[PDB]
């Protein structure tokens, strides 16, 4: 039943049906074996799209709210989306804790899962409030930081996972903690250190570096 689930996931993906894709990957993960590379990314992409659909909606709604009897109605709808965002995050965080990180068994994988734990807590923080916000933020920061250390200890500065982690960690700095200069330093550093060792897959790394460089241009505009 595992080769099956994986094909249905690759289909669902081609067919842009990410609920299905997710369900499949969640079930593959629950079997409790370590995920291969291709399997990690299938899981990652699936949930990225599922949760991404909510985050998008949440911004549109709050923006429409901030641009304004009818406001109790909008607010209620924002919260329906928030509830959805949380289950999805909880689901993913649960998978990372019960399964993925537990059995990581190598640095590259550990870094991927910790980054992800970082990202999903960050998605929660985008909509959190009061002290819920503080707990959420701490949890995100702890994950990224641990990932950051391991990535520095174990991986080449061109590795797309490490670059990706740097990208997301800087975004966290920039938009969640709101320390914009650290955000820049975090990105510029990763960028520069990668740019050095490119004389050494290239397409995988530079896709992410473009993002680093773009963010830097914006955060200095």
């Amino acid at each position: 039943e595992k080769t099956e689930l994986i094909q249905k996931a690759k289909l669902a993906e081609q067919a842009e049906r990410y609920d299905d894709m997710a369900t499949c990957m969640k079930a593959v993960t629950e079997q409790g074996a370590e995920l291969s590379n291709e399997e990690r990314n299938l899981l990652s992409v699936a949930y990225k799209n599922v949760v991404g659909g909510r985050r998008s909606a949440w911004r549109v709604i709050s923006s429409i709210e901030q641009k304004t009897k009818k406001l109790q109605l909008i607010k209620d709808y924002r919260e329906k989306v928030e509830s959805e965002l949380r289950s999805i995050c909880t689901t993913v965080l649960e998978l990372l804790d019960k399964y993925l990180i537990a059995n990581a068994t190598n640095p590259e994988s550990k870094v991927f899962y910790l980054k992800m734990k970082g990202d999903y807590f960050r998605y929660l923080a985008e909509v959190a409030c009061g002290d819920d916000r503080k707990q959420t933020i701490d949890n995100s920061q702890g994950a990224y930081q641990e990932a950051f250390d391991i990535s520095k200890k174990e991986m080449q500065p061109t590795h797309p996972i490490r670059l990706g982690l740097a990208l997301n960690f800087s975004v966290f700095y920039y938009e969640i903690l709101n320390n914009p200069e650290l955000a820049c330093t975090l990105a510029k550093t990763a960028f520069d250190e990668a740019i050095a060792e490119l004389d050494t897959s290239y397409k995988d790394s530079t896709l992410i570096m473009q993002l680093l460089r773009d963010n830097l241009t914006l955060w200095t505009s």
Partner: peptide
């Protein structure tokens, strides 16, 4: 657009 990891 701020952008995050693909």
């Amino acid at each position: 657009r701020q952008r995050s990891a693909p």
